[PDB]
Ligand binder design. Structure first.
Ligand SMILES: [K+]
Ligand SMILES: [K+]
Ligand SMILES: [K+]
Ligand SMILES: [K+]
Ligand SMILES: [K+]
Ligand SMILES: [K+]
Ligand SMILES: [K+]
Ligand SMILES: [K+]
Ligand SMILES: [K+]
Ligand SMILES: [K+]
Ligand SMILES: [K+]
Ligand SMILES: [K+]
Ligand SMILES: [K+]
Ligand SMILES: [K+]
Ligand SMILES: [K+]
Ligand SMILES: [K+]
Ligand SMILES: [K+]
Ligand SMILES: [K+]
Ligand SMILES: [Mg+2]
Ligand SMILES: [Mg+2]
Ligand SMILES: [Mg+2]
Ligand SMILES: [Mg+2]
Ligand SMILES: [Mg+2]
Ligand SMILES: [Mg+2]
Ligand SMILES: [Mg+2]
Ligand SMILES: [Mg+2]
Ligand SMILES: [Mg+2]
Ligand SMILES: [Mg+2]
Ligand SMILES: [Mg+2]
Ligand SMILES: [Mg+2]
Ligand SMILES: [Mg+2]
Ligand SMILES: [Mg+2]
Ligand SMILES: [Mg+2]
Ligand SMILES: [Mg+2]
Ligand SMILES: [Mg+2]
Ligand SMILES: [Mg+2]
Ligand SMILES: [Mg+2]
Ligand SMILES: [Mg+2]
Ligand SMILES: [Mg+2]
Ligand SMILES: [Mg+2]
Ligand SMILES: [Mg+2]
Ligand SMILES: [Mg+2]
Ligand SMILES: [Mg+2]
Ligand SMILES: [Mg+2]
Ligand SMILES: [Mg+2]
Ligand SMILES: [Mg+2]
Ligand SMILES: [Mg+2]
Ligand SMILES: [Mg+2]
Ligand SMILES: [Mg+2]
Ligand SMILES: [Mg+2]
Ligand SMILES: [Mg+2]
Ligand SMILES: [Mg+2]
Ligand SMILES: [Mg+2]
Ligand SMILES: [Mg+2]
Ligand SMILES: [Mg+2]
Ligand SMILES: [Mg+2]
Ligand SMILES: [Mg+2]
Ligand SMILES: [Mg+2]
Ligand SMILES: [Mg+2]
Ligand SMILES: [Mg+2]
Ligand SMILES: [Mg+2]
Ligand SMILES: [Mg+2]
Ligand SMILES: [Mg+2]
Ligand SMILES: [Mg+2]
Ligand SMILES: [Mg+2]
Ligand SMILES: [Mg+2]
Ligand SMILES: [Mg+2]
Ligand SMILES: [Mg+2]
Ligand SMILES: [Mg+2]
Ligand SMILES: [Zn+2]
Lengths: 50, 60, 114
RNA sequence: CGACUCUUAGCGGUGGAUCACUCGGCUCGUGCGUCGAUGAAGAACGCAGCUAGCUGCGAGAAUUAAUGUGAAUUGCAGGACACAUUGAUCAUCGACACUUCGAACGCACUUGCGGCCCCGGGUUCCUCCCGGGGCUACGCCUGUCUGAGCGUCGCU
RNA sequence: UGGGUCGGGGUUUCGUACGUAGCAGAGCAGCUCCCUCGCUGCGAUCUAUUGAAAGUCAGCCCUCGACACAAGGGUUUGU
RNA sequence: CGCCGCAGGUGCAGAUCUUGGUGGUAGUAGCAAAUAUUCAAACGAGAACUUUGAAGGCCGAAGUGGAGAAGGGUUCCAUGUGAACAGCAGUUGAACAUGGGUCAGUCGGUCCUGAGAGAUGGGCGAGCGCCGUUCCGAAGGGACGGGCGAUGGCCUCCGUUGCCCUCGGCCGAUCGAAAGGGAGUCGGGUUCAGAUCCCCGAAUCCGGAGUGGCGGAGAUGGGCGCCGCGAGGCGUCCAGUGCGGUAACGCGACCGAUCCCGGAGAAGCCGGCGGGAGCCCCGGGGAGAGUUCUCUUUUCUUUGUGAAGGGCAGGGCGCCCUGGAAUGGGUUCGCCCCGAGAGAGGGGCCCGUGCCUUGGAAAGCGUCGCGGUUCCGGCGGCGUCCGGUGAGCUCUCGCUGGCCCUUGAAAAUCCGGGGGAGAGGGUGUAAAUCUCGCGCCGGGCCGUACCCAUAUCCGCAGCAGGUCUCCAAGGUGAACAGCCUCUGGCAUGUUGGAACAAUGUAGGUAAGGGAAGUCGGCAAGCCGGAUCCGUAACUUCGGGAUAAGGAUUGGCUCUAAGGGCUGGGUCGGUCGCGGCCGGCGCCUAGCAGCCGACUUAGAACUGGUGCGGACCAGGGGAAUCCGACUGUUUAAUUAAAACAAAGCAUCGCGAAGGCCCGCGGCGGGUGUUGACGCGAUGUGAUUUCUGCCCA
RNA sequence: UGAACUAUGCCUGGGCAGGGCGAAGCCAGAGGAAACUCUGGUGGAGGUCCGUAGCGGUCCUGACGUGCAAAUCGGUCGUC
């Protein structure tokens, strides 16, 4: 909602920063074995815990 | 416009800008961004210009 | 007709959300959030229904910034008791005290016998 | 004549069996056998030039110091670095540091609000405002100070 | 020569169009040197023009009027 | 890997076996709830779906409109991409990628307490702990007051400090509401996305000021001796914590503590009236548009003044003074009021959201132009006017009633009064003190974007379901009904094209008969609004009842009735073509003029008898059974005759108690209770009865 | 571990067109010797009636029944 506590807003802030694509240079690293961010979350498919 | 520490209040922002930029400020407006960082709108005193201060700060 | 919206996040027709219609210099109708209707003091006697005269009817915390004159009447118990009950208490105090003198004199003249 | 259907074979798809491999487990054995109010375990939030996770770290934040080591780190860039008027990296780790919750400790929390003592500034000492620092939990032991009792007494 | 598309005629359905005119019209409102019984409006409706108006093959009938278009396309088939 | 030995988690077709993969079904079912799309153009490789324009429609203010709460959490906004996803497509997107965006003393949180939650004391408990919330506590750590002192120092003298005396029950920590209580921000402008937060301009609340910031108030007058022609001066003495009104009460302040009293906060639902505003409506004046085939001085749009002050209307008063009323009178829609003081006259107070004024026109808006600053809060001209109506709608304020075996919070917080401990100064250009005017300083922390739903929430999803609110135009009409429309919005609900077979789903019609159909009139059909008549049995007298039954209903042209405002004067007898007193006169069966809502009744004429023409909108009657009624019930097959109910009856109990909870505490609920009360049963309104049996 | 659905108590908020019938109370007129009665208005009661929103869910034993939906939709309905 519009009325939110600081903890809830701070919690939402962290979930927002970590929902980004992996940097491209990562695949160039030796022994990368990572293709894409498997922890991507869309607001409509899956809802946050809180 | 500055990005400040989330624990700093308006009084602390006012003193911080005053000493390390040698300017006088009129008021400080504060919000916390959706990314979690705190943003401060620091309005300078009328006798100070925000354009040359930004020029010597280096954010032109 | 131009329809209106609330200007605050309180969306319910509660007692603290009362509004009135105002026409701005910009020629538009807006809600103005009114203050609650204040009441004059009731008399300290508790026997007469009418509220006190000469005292402004405002909310209790507004009385802090009003001058003394606007909150009382220039008379004994003014701003706390109505004039009628003040007159009654003046008469009652005098008459009861006078009647105390009567019973005091009455025993004084009745004690003349051993 | 062709279509269609069936069987078989070649090739091609679909699919991921089989086989080979294994920085993982499972089991047994050995030596140690160490947490915490000096704030544990756990949790949260942050920290990289480019960095989401994992990992590491705590506003000194993908690390400081020290010691060993001895030329790297590396995906890209950058700049170091006489390797001796001392040194990349890695390891070790005894110095320093170590945000917020949490036994969690001023009171309270899906919020917020105090009190006391110092320091600095606006004051231009008197105490109002702002900032900084240190305290302010419960139980309990020894001692200390201040006390209570028509408890037991003594003297007047 | 053909078949179309319009038009026309026929058939048929409904029921008498708009406009204009009327000393038709329950009445009502203004003008009276006027008028010697009148004029100027409003007024549903009525009458005449007007069995009018409108539709009618899209799976109605006949055109020979008008217009353009029609020896064009593709795929196969042999005793 | 063979051979000799050794050892097994050692051999699969099944177990509706486990996991994974793949077929036929099958290019099939299907992509059919809520009326609807079409033309042209642009971009683009590509257009039924994107964008623009044009047209036709829909939502029709109880919206498919504009904004919020909860919930979501970046979905918000720009640019780009076009893999996947959006069950067709897409040049589009709530997709993907890259950037950006949420600004507060006065909007909330924060504070208060509510139902309640919950420590501590105490009690219990093997124990983690839990019982209990004033109960089995030495539960006040505060205070202007006074004293003893340290003089800490601008040691005059006031601020400090330690102790003592005196006073001191929120008698209970703490938590508990973004809808309750709760001081104080409004107008204009501005963005791609933020504004009551930014900018501009106007305010305002709270807190602070020791050395006291300025004014004003307190507060500055009399008596006597003298000087002085008088006016005016000197000395002494005495006052002085304001003043006015008969009153209601008024005035700018208007000394005062502990303590006490009171007020506000602080109160249900419903009815009927009245005031104010906003909207709607009507008549003009402008400005800009629309129509002009003919008519239309026409149709449409638009035509401002915030908060906060001051003044004035208006509304209210269970406020005061005079006076004393029956031949009772005033008065409302209703009421109701009066020798406990009517009517009448004169005052006082409260509210004042209305008007005028400062704000204010400089802003805003509408128009007509002119400059450019890639995209100026550009510059300029003109205007922003006068009126009238109302059972109209919506808010709000007020008055007066009704209902209750229902009586409809608390606390923070603020204020008035009573009392008078004290303090202040010696007649000064004075003191203590000040709720008066102005001036100076400060207001931290968190939230703030967007959606708020036939696509941003829950239902596995862009799911016909669910999800709390605010605003609310014109016509018709009884109406927030239904139907049409304006503002605003949308593209028909996850596809289109072509046809118009069966069967279906939804909706109509049907000659003659009229329930013969069927378990059964199921379904459908009939009726339906309003006016005027007219209404039975029965009845608990209230009802039944819109009983039943009948007539009328359009259009046009009239005719009557139902109101409100003003003015009713006999005259120069004279001068402030008008005014002071009067010789100078009889509307007194009331007239004269002006203005204005709807409603009702009657009549004529008229149409192919059609007229509540769409919409809206009871079929009726005679009986039997059950339940008295209203109410409730098996969410998802039973709405009933079942449950409940008022009424009736019975039973327990006087607190060391009845009933009940509890592992436990002399723990807890009823109980903030006390027999007209609690607790336990049965029966089930009213009426009338309720027989016999205690084996 | 759950009262985010539901059941019930409490606290604090919000909400419910337009009409019909016409209880008490009141006024006037009339008839009465009285007791009192009749008539016309006024008034606006009610777990009152028709009927919106809301709440509910009767019938079609309608639609749907690999649904829009693991209970929904249409009309008709109960209460308002
Ligand atoms: K007063
Ligand atoms: K004609
Ligand atoms: K004719
Ligand atoms: K609150
Ligand atoms: K009610
Ligand atoms: K006009
Ligand atoms: K202009
Ligand atoms: K006093
Ligand atoms: K919301
Ligand atoms: K077909
Ligand atoms: K039958
Ligand atoms: K009912
Ligand atoms: K039922
Ligand atoms: K008991
Ligand atoms: K019984
Ligand atoms: K027996
Ligand atoms: K017996
Ligand atoms: K009623
Ligand atoms: Mg903020
Ligand atoms: Mg509130
Ligand atoms: Mg105004
Ligand atoms: Mg193959
Ligand atoms: Mg090092
Ligand atoms: Mg709170
Ligand atoms: Mg002793
Ligand atoms: Mg023809
Ligand atoms: Mg086996
Ligand atoms: Mg097998
Ligand atoms: Mg098909
Ligand atoms: Mg289909
Ligand atoms: Mg419509
Ligand atoms: Mg909306
Ligand atoms: Mg968007
Ligand atoms: Mg698709
Ligand atoms: Mg995205
Ligand atoms: Mg106490
Ligand atoms: Mg609280
Ligand atoms: Mg916005
Ligand atoms: Mg004005
Ligand atoms: Mg009077
Ligand atoms: Mg102007
Ligand atoms: Mg006093
Ligand atoms: Mg918003
Ligand atoms: Mg839905
Ligand atoms: Mg969801
Ligand atoms: Mg779920
Ligand atoms: Mg359709
Ligand atoms: Mg479509
Ligand atoms: Mg949809
Ligand atoms: Mg028939
Ligand atoms: Mg027939
Ligand atoms: Mg039969
Ligand atoms: Mg039969
Ligand atoms: Mg039926
Ligand atoms: Mg009957
Ligand atoms: Mg007629
Ligand atoms: Mg029943
Ligand atoms: Mg009965
Ligand atoms: Mg039910
Ligand atoms: Mg059921
Ligand atoms: Mg049922
Ligand atoms: Mg009975
Ligand atoms: Mg009973
Ligand atoms: Mg709960
Ligand atoms: Mg609940
Ligand atoms: Mg009812
Ligand atoms: Mg009913
Ligand atoms: Mg249904
Ligand atoms: Mg069925
Ligand atoms: Zn009184």
């Amino acid at each position: 909602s519009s009325h939110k506590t600081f903890r809830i807003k701070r919690f939402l802030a962290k979930k927002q920063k970590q929902n980004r694509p992996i940097p491209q240079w990562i695949r160039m690293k030796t022994g990368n074995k990572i293709r894409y961010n498997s922890k991507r979350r869309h607001w409509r498919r899956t809802k946050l815990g809180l | 416009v500055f990005i400040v520490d989330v624990k700093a209040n308006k009084h602390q922002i006012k003193q911080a800008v005053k000493k390390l930029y040698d300017i006088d400020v009129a008021k400080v407006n504060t919000l916390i961004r959706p990314d979690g960082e705190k943003k401060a709108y620091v309005r300078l005193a009328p006798d100070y210009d925000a354009l040359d201060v930004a020029n010597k700060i280096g954010i032109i | 007709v131009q329809r209106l919206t609330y200007r605050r996040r309180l969306s319910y027709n509660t007692a603290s959300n009362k509004t009135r219609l105002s026409r701005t210099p910009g020629n538009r109708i807006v809600y103005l959030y009114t203050k609650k209707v204040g009441k004059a003091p009731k008399s300290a006697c508790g026997v007469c229904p009418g509220r006190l005269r000469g005292v402004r009817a405002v909310r209790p915390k507004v009385l802090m910034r009003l001058s003394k004159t606007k909150k009382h009447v220039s008379r004994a118990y003014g701003g706390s008791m109505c004039a009628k009950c003040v007159r009654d208490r003046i008469k009652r105090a005098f008459l009861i005290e006078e009647q105390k003198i009567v019973v005091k004199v009455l025993k004084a003249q009745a004690q003349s016998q051993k």
